[PDB]
Design an enzyme around this catalytic site. Structure first.
Site, PDB file in Angstrom:
ATOM      1  N   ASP A  20       0.856  -1.172   0.000  1.00 40.31           N
ATOM      2  CA  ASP A  20       0.000   0.000   0.000  1.00 40.31           C
ATOM      3  C   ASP A  20       0.892   1.221   0.000  1.00 40.31           C
ATOM      4  O   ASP A  20       2.031   1.163   0.450  1.00 40.31           O
ATOM      5  CB  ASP A  20      -0.888  -0.018   1.248  1.00 40.31           C
ATOM      6  CG  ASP A  20      -1.950   1.076   1.241  1.00 40.31           C
ATOM      7  OD1 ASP A  20      -2.145   1.730   0.188  1.00 40.31           O
ATOM      8  OD2 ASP A  20      -2.595   1.270   2.299  1.00 40.31           O
ATOM      9  N   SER A  21       0.386   2.329  -0.514  1.00 39.81           N
ATOM     10  CA  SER A  21       1.172   3.551  -0.556  1.00 39.81           C
ATOM     11  C   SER A  21       0.950   4.320   0.738  1.00 39.81           C
ATOM     12  O   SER A  21       1.281   5.494   0.839  1.00 39.81           O
ATOM     13  CB  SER A  21       0.741   4.395  -1.749  1.00 39.81           C
ATOM     14  OG  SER A  21      -0.660   4.625  -1.698  1.00 39.81           O
ATOM     15  N   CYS A  48      -3.710  -0.283  -2.021  1.00 42.22           N
ATOM     16  CA  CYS A  48      -3.686   1.005  -2.683  1.00 42.22           C
ATOM     17  C   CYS A  48      -4.532   0.951  -3.956  1.00 42.22           C
ATOM     18  O   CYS A  48      -4.206   0.221  -4.904  1.00 42.22           O
ATOM     19  CB  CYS A  48      -2.239   1.378  -3.024  1.00 42.22           C
ATOM     20  SG  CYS A  48      -2.030   2.846  -4.083  1.00 42.22           S
ATOM     21  N   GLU A  77      -7.272   9.783  10.853  1.00 42.20           N
ATOM     22  CA  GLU A  77      -5.891   9.716  11.170  1.00 42.20           C
ATOM     23  C   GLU A  77      -5.515  10.571  12.354  1.00 42.20           C
ATOM     24  O   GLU A  77      -4.393  10.602  12.755  1.00 42.20           O
ATOM     25  CB  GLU A  77      -5.052  10.049   9.968  1.00 42.20           C
ATOM     26  CG  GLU A  77      -4.675   8.866   9.123  1.00 42.20           C
ATOM     27  CD  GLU A  77      -3.707   9.216   8.059  1.00 42.20           C
ATOM     28  OE1 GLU A  77      -3.282  10.343   8.059  1.00 42.20           O
ATOM     29  OE2 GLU A  77      -3.363   8.394   7.244  1.00 42.20           O
ATOM     30  N   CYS A 126     -12.639   3.511   0.731  1.00 45.11           N
ATOM     31  CA  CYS A 126     -11.386   3.941   1.322  1.00 45.11           C
ATOM     32  C   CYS A 126     -11.170   3.083   2.567  1.00 45.11           C
ATOM     33  O   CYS A 126     -12.104   2.877   3.355  1.00 45.11           O
ATOM     34  CB  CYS A 126     -11.457   5.421   1.707  1.00 45.11           C
ATOM     35  SG  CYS A 126     -10.019   6.040   2.636  1.00 45.11           S
ATOM     36  N   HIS A 180      -9.643   3.777   5.241  1.00 44.91           N
ATOM     37  CA  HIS A 180      -9.731   4.567   6.464  1.00 44.91           C
ATOM     38  C   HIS A 180     -11.141   4.533   7.043  1.00 44.91           C
ATOM     39  O   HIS A 180     -11.341   4.787   8.231  1.00 44.91           O
ATOM     40  CB  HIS A 180      -9.307   6.013   6.198  1.00 44.91           C
ATOM     41  CG  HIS A 180      -7.822   6.210   6.164  1.00 44.91           C
ATOM     42  ND1 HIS A 180      -7.029   5.711   5.154  1.00 44.91           N
ATOM     43  CD2 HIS A 180      -6.988   6.851   7.015  1.00 44.91           C
ATOM     44  CE1 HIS A 180      -5.769   6.037   5.384  1.00 44.91           C
ATOM     45  NE2 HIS A 180      -5.718   6.730   6.508  1.00 44.91           N
TER      46      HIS A 180
END
Lengths: 263, 263
Positions: free
Chosen positions: A10-11, A73, A152, A183, A185
């Site tokens: 993943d980036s 990603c 985050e 996503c 997240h």
């Protein structure tokens, strides 16, 4: 048994939510994770360069002797996934396909929504996948660029966060029966998102869906690990290991050690 | 899309419950089913001859241009499945592995029970699969040879049937947390079986589990059929088509036509 670990590329730090799902669902499987923060935004790079970067991440994962590679990603997935998958002998999967497929199987009236990152929404990867299989389903995509930051910064329940999600999802309220959380997240805002969309909307978590597929793919390929066992995962990042474990230790509800590396 | 059908081989009419699950879960997929009644009991035949028979069923399925083959016969599965799977390019699966794997993932205390046909219980195929992956789990197998007949005579709710299941399952009552229904007939007695085992026991339907795997395996291999579509299945039997559609028309809740064939 097959004691090799399942690798994740993943980036960023996002793919770690999929790792959480994996730990949750398949406790006994070893994990190797490579996050390429140093290079940052993949999306706004050139295809050629993104394939370069991805292969670098894949080759690193290969030299960890992984028995399966998982693309976290969306950009790497959009650009490389099919090529790498064709080139490798081990199973190679992404979270997009499972997310799309689940949305399709779960939509009541064919009104599917998908929220995600600006780059993800810009690639329109989810819509393309969904309609490529079920071109009669209506996909409405919406970028929610405040979501990552909120998550985050640990804050999923602030009254500000609640407002932000509320305002960001408005364009979809009442217009869809299922919403794909495009996503990694976003799983962390699920309560709030479900709340804002109402008990009427079906939330699809790509990462969770992906994990389910893994289970079936380990059995099919006869490469399951020791069920009585993992207690030994490995995390790598190409940039800022400090905040990596910071977020990681929170999501994975345990202290985890990262290893700053340079490909 | 991949408009080829998914083929099913079985030495009987039992595999049709898996077909029902398939129709239920993946309405848009074409089906080709071959039941080898004429040869009857597979179990008490010699390995060599069972491989002969199976290959015959597999070759017939190949000349139906199937994009996947599903083994419904535990005997054919025990004896051939791995060989055929290794020989073919298309995905080849059975219901046993998914049943076993589900039981493992679902057992609370590691006390797994498995009921089934005398031959199935005699091969101890389920226990072997379960412990081969999770050798620390305790498997108790029990043959319930009155179950098939009951089912095949439509009668799942008679007061006699209720007694029969009650008496047949007694040896397991209070001794297990999950029970694998190791026979494809058995899904039809689920209410009664769940009732006799109590709300405490987790029932695992191999066929249903198998279907779930199919879904993931169609996506992985990029061979999904038209989602907006099947309305064209094909059923074959090597013996007594009359009672085939008889039972089939009942289970599949619709009139279906069988074609008596000779391999």
């Amino acid at each position: 048994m097959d004691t090799r670990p399942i690798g994740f590329l993943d980036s960023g730090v996002g793919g770690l939510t999929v790792v959480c799902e994996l730990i949750r669902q398949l406790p006994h499987e070893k994990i190797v994770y490579i996050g390429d923060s140093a290079r940052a935004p993949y999306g706004p790079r050139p295809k050629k360069q993104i394939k370069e970067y991805t292969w670098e991440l894949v080759n690193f994962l290969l030299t960890q002797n992984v028995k399966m590679i998982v693309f976290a990603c969306n950009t790497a997935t959009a650009v490389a996934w099919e090529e790498v998958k064709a080139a490798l002998d081990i199973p190679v999967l992404g979270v997009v396909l499972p997310g799309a497929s689940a949305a399709i199987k779960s939509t009541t009236k064919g009104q599917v929504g998908v929220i995600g990152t600006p780059m993800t929404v810009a690639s329109d990867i989810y819509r393309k996948k969904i309609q490529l299989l079920a071109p009669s389903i209506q996909v409405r995509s919406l970028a929610c660029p405040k979501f990552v930051p909120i998550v985050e910064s640990n804050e999923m329940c602030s009254s500000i966060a609640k407002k932000i999600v509320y305002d960001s999802l408005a364009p979809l309220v009442g217009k869809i029966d299922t919403l794909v959380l495009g996503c990694t997240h976003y799983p962390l805002l699920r309560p709030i998102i479900q709340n804002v969309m109402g008990p009427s909307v079906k939330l699809i978590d790509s990462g969770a869906e992906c994990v389910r597929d893994i289970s079936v793919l380990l059995n099919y390929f006869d490469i399951n690990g020791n069920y009585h066992q993992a207690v030994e995962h490995r995390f790598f990042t190409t940039a800022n290991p400090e905040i990596f474990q910071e977020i990681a230790s929170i999501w994975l509800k345990q202290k985890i050690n990262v290893e700053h590396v340079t490909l």
